[PDB]
């Protein structure tokens, strides 16, 4: 949506990227994991 | 049940594991998920994560300055509720030095223990599909039916004659 | 302005949210937990009522006693209709129950006399400092979240017990008068009305339902990326997913 | 007793004993507390200060009277 | 100390009245008693799983109201058995020189008997000896060994040269916070020795037993709860067939431990976790009951102790009301002298300081108890007597010269009533019709 | 520190003249005079309704105290149709 | 503790002489008509009310300057400077202005609170004196900003924005006259792509 | 310097986390800083997202604060008794070592210094639970019946007492906890 | 959360519902029975009003005393048209329900 499209190049924003790799990583362990604030796994995605 | 990345009890990093099983591992019980929330909950100063400026706890209001106690004491009791699954606190023993300036308080909490509500991200699997026949047994018959009527034999002669 | 007092400003924002965060998701947990109960003991307890206040395990049953209860009164109404006939009288119809209230008065004071560690206000409070314990502050907050997360409390009095009533509102009065105590005043009404075993569920019903947001086709409505897969059991899965289910374009 | 109402103003623990063993007399013991501080008054003689002494139970006990128990049961009433 | 951060923050485990002390045989320390706060702490100390000693801490752990730190007693061992007068797997657990955890397998009497003696030689062998005789003994070298049972049916019998009537007063020296007594011999002069030294030291003694006499015919006065009956001895004896392999003593302890004595709670209906119910016949319960030997009964939809008889016959929390009760007016007093005597101005025999022990007792001892719910209060309408606490003190012109030489206050009398609790139900109806 | 507090403005410009070209509202709002009459501090109480039908969509206001002068401007052009 | 973290700058704060009485009090309401069964749901929070009364005095028994009402009272003659006019024209400004004021009292801490009504008088008893009550109501509120959090936003139909070249034409303003800082590059391109509004 | 001087002695406002610009953070590592500190050698620490001072200890061991209020209570205490003997000496009624006006003294000194601590929170006031002591400032004063013959002749009062408390500030905490589960 | 909850949160449930089932049963029964006749005696009793305190059983006509009744009252209401009327027109007025209501301890 947000890379090379049929009219240019567009940018993405910082939270579409987070929420993305936020679901993949739910995939990843099942709708358990946490990924929110107290995880350290979300400190390591987040930056 | 929270999952996450373990972090060691005794040194803070990642619980890569003893040196026979090295790797990776992922906090499963509940106690060991818990310890570390709180742990981050508190160590986290407040204000000082960038993209969550409400987490952490406000150290700056209370070190440096003259303070009671009892306020202290308060604020900290508080932020360990702030878990949804903390049973209660047991004991708080809040004491204070005044000749080093320094504070120290001991507690504990409890906290029950869930179930998996399912294993297909978790490794293992809990059923028992059957095993082919193996050679021509299916169709002729097999020979443990022999061995076990013979073994039975064997050992009802052995039962009746008294030993 | 100043680029200095940006920072300024930021503090509000932050310490101004802050506060209600602590305050909203404490509520959150509240309506969550469904094995607590709360259950407040007007009066009574020196007068068989005992019995009832050795059940509370402190950890999911909950006794809130106070330090002096002024008054308390129950009044129960009831509704008449009544029509009028050609004999320039009027007669009547039937009636209506309308539910019932219940109100009193106590007090909370900063110097105990009977601090029993049963009662949950006297969780914490210290047995030979009571006064720094700040009992007056403690039952503020443990009375607010009572009431703002709608619990379903059980009095307990003296003449007979009541369920099912829910705090309508109640004050906090620090006069001059008295002092190093509060004045407590509330008021309640009765508010009178998955898992389990399949045996005793019956149909139940949803409506209509349309695409589950946790997974893909809303990312095409929504305009998103397809999460990649695990890479597990590859050459398997994708020759089958691919034939029987395709992708969404 | 100024000695102690300054500490209790202080912490906040009030309550201590009070007993008082009459003679020929009834009797008391219970939980007492300090209500109000009396007034001093310097003049020509010695002053007279009173304390009012609040206390939780005021029922007076025969105690060392005898032939009480077999009395009380003397009493006729419906 | 010099500190390196402003904030350390370490998230870490672990941490009448309550302690009981567990009177075991085994060598895992020298001292005579030691404390411990969970099971875990006892592996670290070399006790093998299913050992005596291991099961008693995990049944008391495991009650509504555990203790929060057990002891362990030691008394020397010389010898251990593994019986196996019952057969169907019957794994074993071996611990030696503290960390050589071999669980020794076998599976399908003196053909296992052997196998097993025969498996412990095929180790390491060059620390310890097995023997076969239907059970088979198991002996150390100077090495610490530790054998618990795994499975099977088979049960741990640990002998020992040394006496519990000798050891007791040896644990005591070394410590003596701890209230509840339990023993592992289990016969017959080794219980009645226990329950003789309980005594003249203020100790409740438990013991789970066996004997299958204890519910034989009331007229047959053969099992031990006889002999305690008889000399009027206060011992919470039960009948359990569990009471050896699992020393269910533990969970008996769990359920008072933690309950201050003034409530007066009573053990009646309370669950047990870990104890069987008991499967005799109706006829066998009433004999038991005559035996004041207390049964774990499964009830309707459900199973629950019966009732807290001692072997005496008066209810168990009678007496731990009563110990309770001895111990606070002691230390009140005592600890009002001292003040006193502390000031400079000690107490004194001139009958007008005598007369403020009313308000000492009264304070300290007898209103906690009230307000506890543990000691009545009120009157009786046919009776017609009041049931207020009452003091009597004896004035100076009653007291002997020779107590005056001996500077000793005698003859002091106190009065209270117990708050009884419910036990029974039993309804009676007729449905009259009118005509 | 603020709240969040409300504001509006409305416009009123010149006559509405329909020609030979698409109407746009816009290019009405300046008067004779230049600037338009605008009405910002002012009690007002409006409804719009909205649809997607052949009917137009229409909105209803109320202004409390307006000046003599707006007035007597809307007075006149009472004939035409002011944007 | 958190009295003296005030400063004089940011933190404004204000002490009143005395403060007679202060009270705390939350609402809520319920369905009249009984439920249909759990449906727990049927019940409303309002907001929290507080109120006060105070008093201000022209003999002052604690100046402590930390207080704003004491920016610039004088040290020995309180009644000449005029502290209950320095309060009132305080307390005026703050309500007007609609300021979320935050109130630290015995027990608990509130933030977010508006001042909906306040009440001055000067009977006859307690001259020299002012009785104060005030009214105070919770506020359930929910550029410069780092692009990291920004979001997208919408500003509905535009027309043509502030008094330029165009705008000063439909009103028929004479346009702005150029200052010639340049007039011989842009001005062979100016006219020839931009045009001129005509 | 620039962090102590705007602001008043009577306060006891702590020197221990307030930043010093223009510093620049002590790079040492952990066990560095543990030597420095056993010197009484305070350092300026870059720390978790900041920079700030230590600890305001002197070289003989007393936190810096309570030096700047003893110095402050010197000063106040020792001009408030002679702007008051003056008064008295400039009407013409000088004060006298009479038993009669010595007295006075505890208002003149419970009134300037005592009272501004304090409102300021400088002194402390109270009980204590454990040591079973007052907190409250005390003051004894000698009569003329214990003033030996040599002071009388010199005109000099001597061995007059007072009693603080002071107020101590909060530097470090540790936290302790443990989760133990049901069973 | 944990299974040891949902053990008993049940019991929450349980208890409660059964509170209905007792007081909500009661009231259905006694509309179901209209044999049963209840009375009250305000005061009356001891100046001759006994005559009719004695026909009371303990079955049917049920009877209730208060420990002491301190006062009651007895009002009736009636309206008219607040217009003139047109001249007997006599039945422009109605009669509302009396009302009683007392004190008691």
Request: aromatic fraction near 8%; charged fraction near 25%.
């Amino acid at each position: 949506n947000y890379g090379l499209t049929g009219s240019g190049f567009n940018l993405p924003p910082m939270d579409d990227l987070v929420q993305e790799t936020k679901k993949t990583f739910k995939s990843a362990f099942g709708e358990d994991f946490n990924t929110e604030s107290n995880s350290v796994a979300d400190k390591l995605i987040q930056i | 049940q929270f999952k996450d990345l373990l972090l060691d009890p005794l040194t803070g990093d990642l619980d890569f594991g003893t040196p026979g099983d090295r790797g990776m591992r992922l906090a499963l019980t509940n106690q060991l998920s818990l310890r570390q929330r709180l742990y981050l909950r508190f160590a986290i100063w407040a204000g000082d994560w960038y993209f969550d400026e409400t987490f952490g706890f406000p150290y700056r209001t209370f070190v440096g300055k003259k303070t009671v106690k009892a306020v202290l004491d308060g604020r900290i009791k508080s932020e360990v509720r702030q878990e949804p699954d903390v049973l209660q606190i047991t004991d708080f023993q809040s004491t204070m030095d005044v000749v080093s300036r320094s504070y120290k308080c001991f507690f504990t909490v409890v906290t029950a223990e869930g179930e998996e509500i399912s294993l297909a991200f978790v490794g293992e699997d809990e059923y028992q599909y059957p095993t082919p026949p193996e050679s021509n047994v299916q169709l002729c018959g097999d020979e443990g039916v022999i061995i076990n009527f013979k073994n039975k034999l064997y050992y009802l002669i052995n039962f009746r004659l008294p030993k | 302005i100043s680029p200095a007092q940006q920072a300024q400003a930021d503090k509000r924002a932050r310490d101004a949210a802050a506060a209600k965060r602590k305050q909203d998701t404490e509520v959150s947990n509240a309506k969550s937990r469904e094995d607590i109960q709360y259950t407040m003991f007007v009066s009574g307890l020196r007068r068989g009522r005992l019995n009832e206040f050795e059940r509370k395990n402190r950890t999911d049953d909950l006794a809130i006693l106070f330090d002096s209860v002024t008054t308390h009164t129950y009044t129960k109404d009831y509704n008449k209709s009544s029509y009028a006939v050609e004999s320039k009288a009027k007669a009547s119809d039937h009636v209506t129950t309308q539910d019932g209230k219940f109100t009193f008065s106590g007090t909370v004071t900063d110097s105990p006399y009977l601090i029993d560690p049963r009662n949950m206000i006297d969780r914490d409070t210290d047995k030979e400092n009571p006064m720094l314990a700040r009992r007056p502050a403690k039952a503020i907050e443990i009375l607010e979240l009572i009431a703002d997360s709608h619990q379903l409390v059980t009095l307990v009095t003296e003449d007979n017990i009541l369920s099912n009533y829910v705090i309508t509102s109640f004050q906090v009065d620090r006069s001059s008068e008295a002092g190093s105590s509060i004045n407590v005043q509330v008021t309640l009404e009765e508010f009178r009305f998955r898992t389990s075993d399949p045996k005793k569920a019956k149909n139940a019903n949803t409506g209509t339902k349309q695409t589950a947001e946790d997974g893909a086709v809303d990312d095409s409505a929504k305009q998103k990326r397809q999460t990649p897969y695990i890479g597990k059991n590859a050459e398997t899965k994708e020759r089958w997913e691919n034939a029987a289910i395709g992708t969404t374009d | 007793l100024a000695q102690w109402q300054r500490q209790a103003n202080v912490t906040g623990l009030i309550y201590l004993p009070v007993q008082v063993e009459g003679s020929q007399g009834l009797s008391l013991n219970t939980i007492g507390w300090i209500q109000k501080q009396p007034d001093l008054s310097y003049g020509t003689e010695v002053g007279q200060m009173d304390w009012e002494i609040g206390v939780l139970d005021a029922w007076l006990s025969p105690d060392q009277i005898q032939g009480i128990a077999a009395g009380i049961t003397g009493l006729l009433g419906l | 100390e010099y500190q390196d951060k402003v904030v350390d923050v370490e998230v870490s485990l672990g941490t009448g009245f309550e302690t009981p002390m567990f009177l075991a045989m085994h060598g895992n320390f020298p001292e005579r008693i030691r404390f411990y706060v969970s099971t875990a702490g006892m592996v670290a100390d070399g006790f093998a799983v299913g050992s005596p000693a291991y099961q008693f801490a995990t049944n008391a752990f495991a009650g509504n109201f555990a203790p929060q730190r057990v002891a362990i007693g030691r008394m020397s061992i010389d010898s251990s058995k593994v019986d196996f007068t019952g057969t169907t797997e019957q794994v074993v657990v071996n611990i030696t020189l503290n960390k050589v955890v071999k669980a020794v397998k076998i599976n399908v009497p003196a053909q296992i008997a052997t196998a097993l003696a025969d498996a412990v030689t095929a180790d390491l062998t060059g620390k310890a000896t097995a023997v076969a005789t239907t059970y088979v003994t198991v002996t150390a070298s100077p090495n610490v060994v530790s054998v618990g049972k795994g499975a099977g049916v088979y049960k741990i019998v640990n002998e020992s040269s040394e006496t519990v009537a000798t050891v007791l007063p040896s644990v005591i020296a070394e410590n003596h916070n701890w209230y509840f007594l339990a023993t592992e011999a289990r016969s017959d002069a080794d219980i009645v020795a226990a329950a003789e030294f309980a005594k003249a030291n203020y100790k409740l003694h438990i013991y789970n037993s066996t004997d299958v006499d204890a519910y034989a015919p009331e007229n047959s006065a053969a099992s031990v709860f006889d002999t305690l009956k008889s000399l009027s001895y206060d011992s919470l004896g039960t009948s359990d067939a569990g009471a050896d392999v699992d020393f269910t003593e533990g969970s008996v302890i769990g359920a008072m431990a933690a309950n201050d004595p003034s409530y007066g709670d009573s053990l009646h209906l309370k669950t047990m976790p870990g104890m069987v119910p008991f499967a005799g016949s109706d006829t066998q319960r009433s004999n038991a009951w005559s035996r004041n030997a207390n049964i774990y009964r499964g009830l309707y939809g459900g199973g629950s102790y019966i009732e807290g008889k001692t072997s005496s016959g008066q209810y168990v929390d009678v007496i731990r009301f009563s110990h309770w009760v001895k111990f606070r007016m002691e230390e009140s007093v005592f600890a009002y002298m001292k003040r006193r005597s502390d000031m400079g101005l000690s107490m004194k025999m001139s009958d007008e300081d005598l007369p403020v022990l009313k308000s000492v007792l009264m304070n300290n001892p007898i209103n906690i108890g009230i307000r506890n719910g543990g000691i009545l209060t009120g009157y009786d309408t046919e009776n017609k007597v009041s049931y207020d606490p009452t003091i009597i003190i004896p004035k100076r012109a009653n007291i002997p010269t020779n107590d005056l030489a001996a500077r000793i206050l005698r003859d002091v009398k106190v009065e209270l009533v117990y708050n009884n609790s419910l036990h029974y139900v039993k309804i009676r109806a007729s449905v009259v019709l009118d005509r | 520190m603020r709240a969040m507090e409300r504001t509006y403005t409305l416009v009123i410009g010149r006559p509405v003249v329909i020609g030979e070209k698409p109407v746009n509202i816009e290019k009405f709002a300046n008067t004779s005079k230049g600037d338009a009459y605008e009405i910002k501090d002012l009690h007002i109480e409006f409804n719009v309704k909205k649809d997607n039908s052949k009917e137009p969509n229409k909105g209803y206001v109320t202004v409390y105290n307006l000046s003599d002068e707006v007035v007597n401007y809307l007075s006149v052009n009472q004939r035409e149709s002011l944007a | 503790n958190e009295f003296e973290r005030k400063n004089r700058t940011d933190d404004l704060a204000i002490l009143f002489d005395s403060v007679t009485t202060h009270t705390y009090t939350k609402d809520y309401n319920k369905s009249s008509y009984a439920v249909e069964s759990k449906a727990s749901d049927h019940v409303t929070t309002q907001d929290g009310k507080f109120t006060f009364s105070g008093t201000v005095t022209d003999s002052p028994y604690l100046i402590d300057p930390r207080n704003m009402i004491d920016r610039d009272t004088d040290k020995e003659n309180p009644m000449l400077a005029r502290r209950p006019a320095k309060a009132i024209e305080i307390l005026e400004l703050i309500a007007d202005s609609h300021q979320l004021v935050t109130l630290v009292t015995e027990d608990n801490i509130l933030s977010n609170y508006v001042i909906t009504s306040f009440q001055v008088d000067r009977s006859s008893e307690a001259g020299s004196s002012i009785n104060v009550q005030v009214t105070l109501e919770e506020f359930r509120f929910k550029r410069t900003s780092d692009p990291k959090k920004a979001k997208n936003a919408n500003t509905g139909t535009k027309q043509t924005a502030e008094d330029g070249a165009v705008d000063d034409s439909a009103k028929q303003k004479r346009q702005t006259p150029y200052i010639g800082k340049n007039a011989e590059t842009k001005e062979r391109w100016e006219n020839a792509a931009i045009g001129t509004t005509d």
